[PDB]
């Protein structure tokens, strides 16, 4: 058919109580003989102080953090608990509208024509490809100049001025995380400053509903984000995020009022595999839905995407292939829905 480039929206079909998830979400057996179940964190949960970042014990546990997970909670991080729950709340006000209004902002255009940006979920490339048990809206913040506004929701009328100013400061973030990291790695904050000049960045809101069989989908399918890194604000998170290490699953919980910074496809390139993308998902849960956001940040289309020179000394040569950003970005886009990741394609 062509019913299959149009799915559904999730958190409709769980509103209407539908008694197992559709075949069109379930997972193979081989993709869920996991149980979908994780280990616990082996080591405590690597938190990283940002208000202590200039200290030299501090970097010490963002350099294990970024090495051993590639990942870490941000704790005294400056942005105000008023603005983290109400972007959190404003944005659950949207999911909670009408269907028909919602629909409104749809990312299939005239209900039929796919793009990115909008609400609902990601590409369907092929007819069998498994679906997640999520929506999302997804939405460009920067540059300021690129955004399109029609797909900014307009209620709650406070959207729209809350996500702006809640993006200004989780870039003031992104601005002193890749500083510390700069030092760690050795090289000019400016060198990753030039390829975050004017660079796209989006947030993501997802959605993840109630599931009636949380062992059989996905609420996001394994994946490794291809930014340069993320920040990820939860709502109340009882659990469901969960990361790889080293091939083992582990149950990772963004206690409230914190943030979890994760490294990307692009920092691991240019990083030259000093540091490590993670791999994560989320599973669902029978009772209650899942809110969270995702502020991602990739590098802009100037220079190619390849392990930075001021790393490649005689001692550690080049890890990785040296790529254009066009073929960097397209590959990350094509390989999302896919098992392989694409970054190993690049690994030398
Ligand atoms: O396919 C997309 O646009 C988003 C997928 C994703 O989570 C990522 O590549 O970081
Ligand atoms: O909702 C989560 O905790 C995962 C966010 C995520 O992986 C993404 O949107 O790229
Ligand atoms: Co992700």
């Given at each position: 058919d062509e019913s299959w480039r149009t799915p559904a929206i999730v958190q409709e079909l769980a509103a209407a109580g539908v008694e197992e998830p559709p075949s069109?979400?379930?997972?193979?057996?081989?993709d869920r003989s996991d149980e979908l179940v994780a280990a616990e964190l082996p080591e405590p949960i690597p938190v990283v102080d940002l208000?202590?970042?200039?200290?030299?014990?501090?970097?010490?546990?963002?350099?294990?953090?970024?090495?051993?997970?590639?990942?870490?909670?941000?704790?005294?991080?400056?942005v105000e608990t008023s603005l983290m729950d109400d972007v959190l709340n404003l944005?659950?006000?949207?999911?909670?509208?009408?269907?028909?209004?919602?629909?409104?902002?749809?990312?299939?255009?005239?209900?039929?024509?796919?793009?990115?940006?909008g609400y609902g979920t990601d590409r369907v490339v092929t007819q069998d490809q498994i679906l997640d048990w999520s929506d999302r809206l997804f939405?460009?913040?920067?540059?300021?100049?690129?955004?399109?506004?029609?797909?900014?929701?307009?209620?709650?009328e406070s959207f729209r001025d809350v996500l702006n100013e809640y993006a200004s400061r989780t870039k003031r973030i992104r601005d002193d995380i890749v500083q510390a990291m700069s030092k760690l790695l050795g090289l000019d904050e400016d060198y990753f400053f030039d390829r975050l000049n004017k660079a796209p960045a989006f947030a993501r809101f997802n959605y993840y509903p109630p599931c009636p069989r949380p062992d059989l989908v996905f609420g996001v399918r394994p994946h490794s984000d291809g930014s340069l890194f993320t920040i990820l604000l939860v709502d109340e998170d009882v659990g469901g995020l969960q990361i790889q290490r080293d091939?083992?699953?582990?149950?990772?919980?963004?206690?409230?009022?914190?943030?979890?910074?994760?490294?990307?496809?692009?920092?691991e390139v240019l990083c030259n595999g000093i540091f490590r993308s993670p791999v994560h998902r989320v599973v669902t849960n029978a009772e209650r839905e899942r809110?969270?956001?995702?502020?991602?940040?990739?590098?802009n289309d100037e220079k190619d995407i390849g392990p930075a020179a001021g790393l490649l000394d005689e001692?550690?040569?080049?890890?990785?292939?040296?790529?254009?950003?066009?073929?960097?970005?397209?590959?990350?886009?094509?390989?999302?829905?896919?098992?392989?990741?694409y970054i190993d394609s690049l690994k030398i």
């Open positions: 069109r979400y379930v997972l193979g057996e081989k208000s202590r970042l200039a200290g030299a014990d501090e970097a010490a546990k963002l350099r294990a953090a970024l090495q051993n997970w590639g990942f870490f909670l941000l704790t005294n991080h400056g944005a659950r006000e949207f999911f909670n509208q009408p269907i028909e209004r919602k629909r409104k902002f749809s990312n299939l255009i005239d209900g039929k024509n796919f793009q990115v940006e939405l460009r913040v920067e540059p300021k100049e690129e955004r399109n506004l029609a797909f900014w929701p307009d209620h709650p091939g083992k699953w582990y149950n990772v919980q963004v206690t409230p009022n914190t943030l979890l910074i994760n490294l990307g496809d692009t920092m809110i969270s956001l995702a502020m991602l940040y990739s590098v001692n550690r040569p080049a890890r990785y292939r040296k790529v254009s950003v066009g073929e960097f970005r397209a590959g990350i886009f094509g390989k999302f829905s896919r098992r392989e990741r």
